[PDB]
Amino acid sequence: DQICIGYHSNNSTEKVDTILERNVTVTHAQDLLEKTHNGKLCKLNGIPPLELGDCSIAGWLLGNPECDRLLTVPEWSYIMEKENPRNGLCYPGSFNDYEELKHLLSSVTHFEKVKILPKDRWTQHTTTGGSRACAVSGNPSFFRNMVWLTKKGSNYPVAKGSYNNTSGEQMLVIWGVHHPNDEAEQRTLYQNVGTYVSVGTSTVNKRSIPEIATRPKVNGQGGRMEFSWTILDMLDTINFESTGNLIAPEYGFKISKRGSSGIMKTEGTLENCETKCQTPLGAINTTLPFHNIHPLTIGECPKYVKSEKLVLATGLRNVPQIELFGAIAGFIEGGWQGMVDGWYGYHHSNDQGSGYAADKESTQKAIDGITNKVNSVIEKMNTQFEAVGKEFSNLEKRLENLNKKMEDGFLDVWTYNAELLVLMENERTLDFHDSNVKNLYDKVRMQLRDNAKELGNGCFEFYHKCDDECMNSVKNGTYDYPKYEEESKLNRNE
Amino acid sequence: DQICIGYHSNNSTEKVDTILERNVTVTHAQDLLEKTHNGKLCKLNGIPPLELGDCSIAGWLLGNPECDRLLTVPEWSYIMEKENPRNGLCYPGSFNDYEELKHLLSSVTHFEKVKILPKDRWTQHTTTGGSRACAVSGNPSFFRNMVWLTKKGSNYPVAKGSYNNTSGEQMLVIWGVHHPNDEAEQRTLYQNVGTYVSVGTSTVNKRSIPEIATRPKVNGQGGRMEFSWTILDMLDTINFESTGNLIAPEYGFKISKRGSSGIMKTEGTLENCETKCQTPLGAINTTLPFHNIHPLTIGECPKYVKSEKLVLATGLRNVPQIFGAIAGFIEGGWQGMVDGWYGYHHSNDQGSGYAADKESTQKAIDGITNKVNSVIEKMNTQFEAVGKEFSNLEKRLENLNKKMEDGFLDVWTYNAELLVLMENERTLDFHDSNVKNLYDKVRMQLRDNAKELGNGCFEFYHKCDDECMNSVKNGTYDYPKYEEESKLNRN
Amino acid sequence: DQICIGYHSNNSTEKVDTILERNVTVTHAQDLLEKTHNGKLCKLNGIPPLELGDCSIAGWLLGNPECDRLLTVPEWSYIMEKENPRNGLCYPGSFNDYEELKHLLSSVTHFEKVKILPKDRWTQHTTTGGSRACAVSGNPSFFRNMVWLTKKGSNYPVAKGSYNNTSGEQMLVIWGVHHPNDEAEQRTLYQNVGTYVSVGTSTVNKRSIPEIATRPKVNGQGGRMEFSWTILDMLDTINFESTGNLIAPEYGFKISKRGSSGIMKTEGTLENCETKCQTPLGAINTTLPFHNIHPLTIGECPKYVKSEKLVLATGLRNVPQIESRGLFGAIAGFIEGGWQGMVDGWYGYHHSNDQGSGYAADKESTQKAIDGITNKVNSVIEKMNTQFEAVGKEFSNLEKRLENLNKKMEDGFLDVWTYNAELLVLMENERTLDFHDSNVKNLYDKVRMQLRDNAKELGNGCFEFYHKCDDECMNSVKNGTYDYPKYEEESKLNRNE
Numbered sequence A: 001d002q003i004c005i006g007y008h009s010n011n012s013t014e015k016v017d018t019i020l021e022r023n024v025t026v027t028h029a030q031d032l033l034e035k036t037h038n039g040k041l042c043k044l045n046g047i048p049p050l051e052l053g054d055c056s057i058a059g060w061l062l063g064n065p066e067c068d069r070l071l072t073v074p075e076w077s078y079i080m081e082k083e084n085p086r087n088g089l090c091y092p093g094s095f096n097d098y099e100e101l102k103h104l105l106s107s108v109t110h111f112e113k114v115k116i117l118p119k120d121r122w123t124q125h126t127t128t129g130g131s132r133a134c135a136v137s138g139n140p141s142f143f144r145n146m147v148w149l150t151k152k153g154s155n156y157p158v159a160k161g162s163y164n165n166t167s168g169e170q171m172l173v174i175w176g177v178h179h180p181n182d183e184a185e186q187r188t189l190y191q192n193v194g195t196y197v198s199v200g201t202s203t204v205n206k207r208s209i210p211e212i213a214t215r216p217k218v219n220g221q222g223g224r225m226e227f228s229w230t231i232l233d234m235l236d237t238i239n240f241e242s243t244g245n246l247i248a249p250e251y252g253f254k255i256s257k258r259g260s261s262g263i264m265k266t267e268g269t270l271e272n273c274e275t276k277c278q279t280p281l282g283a284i285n286t287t288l289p290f291h292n293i294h295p296l297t298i299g300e301c302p303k304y305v306k307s308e309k310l311v312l313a314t315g316l317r318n319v320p321q322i323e324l325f326g327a328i329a330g331f332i333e334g335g336w337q338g339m340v341d342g343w344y345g346y347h348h349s350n351d352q353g354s355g356y357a358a359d360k361e362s363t364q365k366a367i368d369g370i371t372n373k374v375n376s377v378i379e380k381m382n383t384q385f386e387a388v389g390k391e392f393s394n395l396e397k398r399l400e401n402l403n404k405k406m407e408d409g410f411l412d413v414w415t416y417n418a419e420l421l422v423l424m425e426n427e428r429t430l431d432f433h434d435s436n437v438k439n440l441y442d443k444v445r446m447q448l449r450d451n452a453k454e455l456g457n458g459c460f461e462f463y464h465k466c467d468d469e470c471m472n473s474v475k476n477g478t479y480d481y482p483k484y485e486e487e488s489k490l491n492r493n494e
Numbered sequence B: 001d002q003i004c005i006g007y008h009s010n011n012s013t014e015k016v017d018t019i020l021e022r023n024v025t026v027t028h029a030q031d032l033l034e035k036t037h038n039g040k041l042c043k044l045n046g047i048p049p050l051e052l053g054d055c056s057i058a059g060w061l062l063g064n065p066e067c068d069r070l071l072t073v074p075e076w077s078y079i080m081e082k083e084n085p086r087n088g089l090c091y092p093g094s095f096n097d098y099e100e101l102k103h104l105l106s107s108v109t110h111f112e113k114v115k116i117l118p119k120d121r122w123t124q125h126t127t128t129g130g131s132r133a134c135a136v137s138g139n140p141s142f143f144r145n146m147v148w149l150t151k152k153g154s155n156y157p158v159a160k161g162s163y164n165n166t167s168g169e170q171m172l173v174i175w176g177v178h179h180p181n182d183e184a185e186q187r188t189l190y191q192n193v194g195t196y197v198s199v200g201t202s203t204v205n206k207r208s209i210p211e212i213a214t215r216p217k218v219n220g221q222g223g224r225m226e227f228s229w230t231i232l233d234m235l236d237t238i239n240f241e242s243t244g245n246l247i248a249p250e251y252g253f254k255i256s257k258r259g260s261s262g263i264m265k266t267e268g269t270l271e272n273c274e275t276k277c278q279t280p281l282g283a284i285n286t287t288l289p290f291h292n293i294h295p296l297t298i299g300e301c302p303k304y305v306k307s308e309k310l311v312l313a314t315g316l317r318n319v320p321q322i323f324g325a326i327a328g329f330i331e332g333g334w335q336g337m338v339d340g341w342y343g344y345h346h347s348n349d350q351g352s353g354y355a356a357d358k359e360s361t362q363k364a365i366d367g368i369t370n371k372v373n374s375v376i377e378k379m380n381t382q383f384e385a386v387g388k389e390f391s392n393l394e395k396r397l398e399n400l401n402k403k404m405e406d407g408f409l410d411v412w413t414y415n416a417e418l419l420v421l422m423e424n425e426r427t428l429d430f431h432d433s434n435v436k437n438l439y440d441k442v443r444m445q446l447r448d449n450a451k452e453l454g455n456g457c458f459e460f461y462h463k464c465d466d467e468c469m470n471s472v473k474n475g476t477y478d479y480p481k482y483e484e485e486s487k488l489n490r491n
Numbered sequence C: 001d002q003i004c005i006g007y008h009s010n011n012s013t014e015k016v017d018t019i020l021e022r023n024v025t026v027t028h029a030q031d032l033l034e035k036t037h038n039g040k041l042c043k044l045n046g047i048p049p050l051e052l053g054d055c056s057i058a059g060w061l062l063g064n065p066e067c068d069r070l071l072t073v074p075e076w077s078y079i080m081e082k083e084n085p086r087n088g089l090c091y092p093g094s095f096n097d098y099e100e101l102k103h104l105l106s107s108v109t110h111f112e113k114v115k116i117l118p119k120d121r122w123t124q125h126t127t128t129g130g131s132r133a134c135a136v137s138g139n140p141s142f143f144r145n146m147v148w149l150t151k152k153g154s155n156y157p158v159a160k161g162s163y164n165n166t167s168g169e170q171m172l173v174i175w176g177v178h179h180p181n182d183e184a185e186q187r188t189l190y191q192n193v194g195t196y197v198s199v200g201t202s203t204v205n206k207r208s209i210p211e212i213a214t215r216p217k218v219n220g221q222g223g224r225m226e227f228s229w230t231i232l233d234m235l236d237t238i239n240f241e242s243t244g245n246l247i248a249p250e251y252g253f254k255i256s257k258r259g260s261s262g263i264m265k266t267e268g269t270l271e272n273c274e275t276k277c278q279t280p281l282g283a284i285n286t287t288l289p290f291h292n293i294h295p296l297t298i299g300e301c302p303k304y305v306k307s308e309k310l311v312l313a314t315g316l317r318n319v320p321q322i323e324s325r326g327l328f329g330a331i332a333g334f335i336e337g338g339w340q341g342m343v344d345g346w347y348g349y350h351h352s353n354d355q356g357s358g359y360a361a362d363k364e365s366t367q368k369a370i371d372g373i374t375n376k377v378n379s380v381i382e383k384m385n386t387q388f389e390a391v392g393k394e395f396s397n398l399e400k401r402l403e404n405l406n407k408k409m410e411d412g413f414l415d416v417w418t419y420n421a422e423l424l425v426l427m428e429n430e431r432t433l434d435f436h437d438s439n440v441k442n443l444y445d446k447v448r449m450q451l452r453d454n455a456k457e458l459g460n461g462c463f464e465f466y467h468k469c470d471d472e473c474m475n476s477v478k479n480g481t482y483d484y485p486k487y488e489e490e491s492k493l494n495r496n497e
């Protein structure tokens, strides 16, 4: 008659990591890292994104003739842009505060083009100007959303234009100034010398003087156009005045939707899916709390860590019994492969029956503790750092370096935190299982007191031939020492 | 004869958290977080702050007629500014490098107004300009610290003015340029076209051309005024030259005190109390090492963590035991003991007792005190937040600042919570291990002359008195003396 | 008739820190912090640095007469500069985007000077202008790399100049504009009022108008010179045009090597060494993974932490057996201290038979403990290689907010990593000491379980057998193949007595 104490064993092959030891096989393990994507760009919560193709943001907003499919655009969830777009400013020039405009657009979802200064209103100027830089079917053309004002006949009168915003939302207005390359061009276009362009709102006051200089030919042109933008508030008016060199707007952009969006730098095309998280390399469909695909992300999906494997050890160490009679063994030499009922067991051999009964109170406590540990580990890492895309100009290298260093540092800190937490928790889990088995064995030894012959394999042979009910009493904790101690003493005295 | 090993219990209802367990009752605990404030603004170390009221920094430094109570200002600890002040620039315009000026002012404690260009020196111009934008009792007026220069008759001679910084410290100077709305206003105000304003020092060199354009009316005016500033070093000179459109200064602001200060964005008011540090919501009065009121504080007071609870366990589990034959540590704690933590219940032929141990308890107390001190000390070099202001065209910089501060606060909060949880686990395991070690020590000393009852203590196989049990407690138990006695009774 | 279980103690004196106790003596420990330097500025991989001396970057690039030894410079590994150099802009003025130029130079290793606008192409102007602000031997002079254009007679024709970049690499070009102090100076120098300076490239378009004003005298002059720069791409053209106030370049700087370098603020002089990384205070020669000298380093060498000590406990606890029973006295075990006669391993099996004694060492436990501790040290060192490295940056007088942001970011990351390292060391020390204690207890418990009841424990660390044993039985107990069913009768018979 003997009750033996041991633990569970199975045929799992999962391997976890520990600070003191690597390459450790366990019974059950939980994976927290997702490393798979479908590699396709597609729709976020039913709203397709805005595909710019070979066009840039400036080329879309100004109305490049090549970007003629973006004249009217529906609601979008994010914007696809290429690293080096081909169709930008067809006429060579610059764009003031381009990165600030992109940052503002990174949180706008829909637009609404409003005709604020119709082309027919300029009855004292010529509005059919064009250039060969932006040519359609050989003939010269121009930006579709802007008007090029030139002299009519031989005089260029003072040009005035105003607009009072009553559209119900904030508005985006873009204008420009032309810089010719010689006085002959200036006289043949505007007939005046010493011109100015003045723009004035309630908070904006600018005066621009054109600069005439010789420059290298870009797109076959020596001149340049400089573009500026502003945000017009509700019930606020904008005023234009110029004696020449004014590229007046015709359309204003009204902010309609607003929301959470972004500009994603990719070179792919939109496919047919339905996803919830989108990365530049692909989409993610998972319920795991971590991922290692790309730091930049639009939507809702797990956090980012630079790790290759994050596995949490939930079960016990997998060391079997190493492959005739009386081999009931114990937890000293290994686990039991034939329990499959619980975690810590009470294998027994009574004079009439034998079995592999499993404990219930200790297993429940261990499971509750492990589940609490897993939940705490997950809940400690939902306040991580999220990266937001930003763009910088050629003369903003210090700021770009600062941003990159900040992002990299925070990412490294959080990765280190996650790895250290997983390793330490694995160590404590294995120690916890060993301690629980030892505590069970010690409690049974204390209860059995003297009427037991401890064998050293992990279990003890009784000094009395006590039946089942005695043994369920031992397992339950209600073993009565003086009930049957006289017979045990008599048997031991032999 | 029985000697039982156990642990102390009481009636406390303090709960701590752990990685494996939640809401565990402990005998003793320490709170590390303050969550209360008086909801008031008052003096920092006896120096009252500077209450702007319905005014802004630009309106105070330029001399807005509504801010006439700030013409002379004493020493201050911090500046109270509303989010959207009403009295700023009376005449519409703009201020160049405003945020840099605020950043500079955040480390200045006292000013001193010095008359650097008296109004009467401009004997070839008119210095009685005004506007209805800032009018007092109907009649037009102007900024009190600046001079508007206008025709004298029908001519505007070239205006020249210089100042040499012999005051004693650095000085702040402000000047302005006027942009009219039409040529008629320019001709009736200055009688010149194509004017300029030139300012030059040993470092700065500027020349501004006025702009004339049609603009929407703000405060009833279509014109604008553009203001600039510079810091004049000691024994340096500043020169003014203009043929028109010049708003010249009359006073300069000398940096007198310097120190550590800040600007608070609050809508409250100053009342009569005293504090050691101040937050925008109220004052803090504590000796605790953490708080969760507001990240931006001025003074000397604890670190900020975005947490609702931070409790450290400095005691044992509260599991009280529930006739005769007093049990031990297997069944639970003892309420009788009041002296120490680890128990050595005393029972004998003539008297019993509830004696404590003075060796293990001292070691445990020293270890726990060292742990608490290490936890508090390892966190005295954590991040602190400093206020900053950004313009409408610096949203990327503002986002970078906000993200950096938020990330550092999150990192430190995570560190705090993880440390507290791990230390609580370690403390509970430490106390259990200490009790087990005491029991094992007693069992090792008592080889065979005792029998294990199994519930936490032994019954001796031999008769003894207080001497034997005191020897057991002191680790001087000797086997050979009472050996034959026990071997006889073992039969 | 006695085997005993114990551990190892020696003559060491190293001390470690623990989260529960301070200044604990351990047998072996490993240091991870380097706190020494030679206090010298030396070569980096055989390439000497660029010694500016009393000159600034602007003075070197523009060609100050005092910096005449830097006209031709070889390859460099880093740049040594002073906090407040004396010889900068000889003629007073400014330098637009100075800090951006310094940031660009922080990744350039060699320069090669190309003559792009020879001084003799200006056949309609005067190219011998000079000033007394920077004069050699009393006679007036000017920047050696730039040309000051003035009148030839009583006229100033329009000046034009172009260059096509066929040098094979990106190029740095610097020009300037002169602001006089009165109209008399302007007429004496140019005979033109309303002049302009226009510079135009593929992506650059600028136009400057000189400003005339009265300013205080700096180095005896009331005028200022404003300098601008640009980077010229390959196969691109730069155009110049001015009616006056043009300070044209003669040489252009061609980027040749490129690499990882920086600008170091020091007041020292170069000496003869060969180091692998350099700090502003000195050079470092170490194999440790940490140092606490200076946050700004150039080269390859360990990470930086604000700590005074970082010692890892790789050994046991030094608690020697203070009591020493002279001659007579049984040898105790592990409860009352460690042993000194042990010289082989950490956990031992001292035995005392009738034909001799011994101090043997268990090899199964010692090797496992060594493997575990080595893995622990390797993991600790590995986890801290993804630290934060600081980079020097310069800011102007109107960028205080950005400077504060940079300083706070660097400092905060520094404190975070220092805290991480210190906490890891403390916790690992605690776990190591408890690990050794648990290993000794496990050895004792294992032998007790194997040996069952054929002995009597004395509680001092070991037990005396109830039967006669020899070297074979000692070896069987130590190895783990003790045979109970062959001694039970004799053991019981002896114990009954």
Ligand SMILES: *[C@@H]1O[C@H](CO)[C@@H](O[C@@H]2O[C@H](CO)[C@@H](O)[C@H](O)[C@H]2NC(C)=O)[C@H](O)[C@H]1NC(C)=O
Binding pocket: A164, A165, A166, A235, A236, A237, B216
């Ligand atoms: C721009 O349009 C708004 C709306 O029509 C104008 O605001 C109105 O101004 C008149 C003044 O004659 C008031 O009587 C109305 O009550 C105003 N309406 C609202 C809704 O406030 C505004 O004046 C126009 N801007 C300009 C420069 O004329």
Ligand SMILES: *[C@@H]1O[C@H](CO)[C@@H](O[C@@H]2O[C@H](CO)[C@@H](O)[C@H](O)[C@H]2NC(C)=O)[C@H](O)[C@H]1NC(C)=O
Binding pocket: B164, B165, B166, B235, B236, B237, C216
């Ligand atoms: C501003 O004032 C200071 C001191 O009043 C002037 O410095 C003095 O200059 C004279 C030149 O004639 C010297 O003789 C003195 O020794 C200087 N004194 C000191 C204390 O340095 C300074 O020159 C004045 N600024 C200007 C532009 O003249």
Ligand SMILES: *[C@@H]1O[C@H](CO)[C@@H](O[C@@H]2O[C@H](CO)[C@@H](O)[C@H](O)[C@H]2NC(C)=O)[C@H](O)[C@H]1NC(C)=O
Binding pocket: A216, C164, C165, C166, C235, C236, C237
């Ligand atoms: C600068 O020099 C390059 C190379 O010498 C010029 O590029 C050549 O342009 C001509 C056009 O007339 C082509 O026929 C050649 O094939 C080009 N050569 C190369 C190597 O690309 C370039 O045109 C010059 N810049 C200017 C403004 O003329």
Ligand SMILES: *[C@@H]1O[C@H](CO)[C@@H](O)[C@H](O)[C@H]1NC(C)=O
Binding pocket: A022, A023
């Ligand atoms: C297990 O073997 C070695 C242990 O040192 C380890 O390097 C290796 O990576 C492990 N095996 C796998 C498949 O990772």
Ligand SMILES: *[C@@H]1O[C@H](CO)[C@@H](O)[C@H](O)[C@H]1NC(C)=O
Binding pocket: A274, A275, A285, A286
């Ligand atoms: C995401 O994966 C789940 C698997 O649980 C699947 O049922 C679901 O259809 C997937 N979603 C998409 C959009 O493919």
Ligand SMILES: *[C@@H]1O[C@H](CO)[C@@H](O)[C@H](O)[C@H]1NC(C)=O
Binding pocket: B022, B023
């Ligand atoms: C204590 O915390 C547990 C979470 O495990 C919660 O279920 C319980 O309600 C809490 N007790 C009280 C009194 O709030």
Ligand SMILES: *[C@@H]1O[C@H](CO)[C@@H](O)[C@H](O)[C@H]1NC(C)=O
Binding pocket: B274, B275, B285, B286
């Ligand atoms: C701060 O609290 C203490 C209580 O410890 C009290 O004595 C003191 O008066 C308080 N300070 C003020 C300003 O009320």
Ligand SMILES: *[C@@H]1O[C@H](CO)[C@@H](O)[C@H](O)[C@H]1NC(C)=O
Binding pocket: C011, C012
């Ligand atoms: C301790 O003993 C060792 C013996 O190997 C010796 O080398 C060392 O110098 C001694 N230390 C002191 C401080 O005497």
Ligand SMILES: *[C@@H]1O[C@H](CO)[C@@H](O)[C@H](O)[C@H]1NC(C)=O
Binding pocket: C022, C023
């Ligand atoms: C070692 O640390 C303890 C801290 O408990 C301190 O009291 C002692 O002075 C220290 N010893 C030395 C030599 O620094």
Ligand SMILES: *[C@@H]1O[C@H](CO)[C@@H](O)[C@H](O)[C@H]1NC(C)=O
Binding pocket: C274, C275, C285, C286
């Ligand atoms: C660096 O130190 C080692 C000793 O650890 C020495 O052998 C080597 O010569 C030193 N290097 C130099 C450059 O002095």
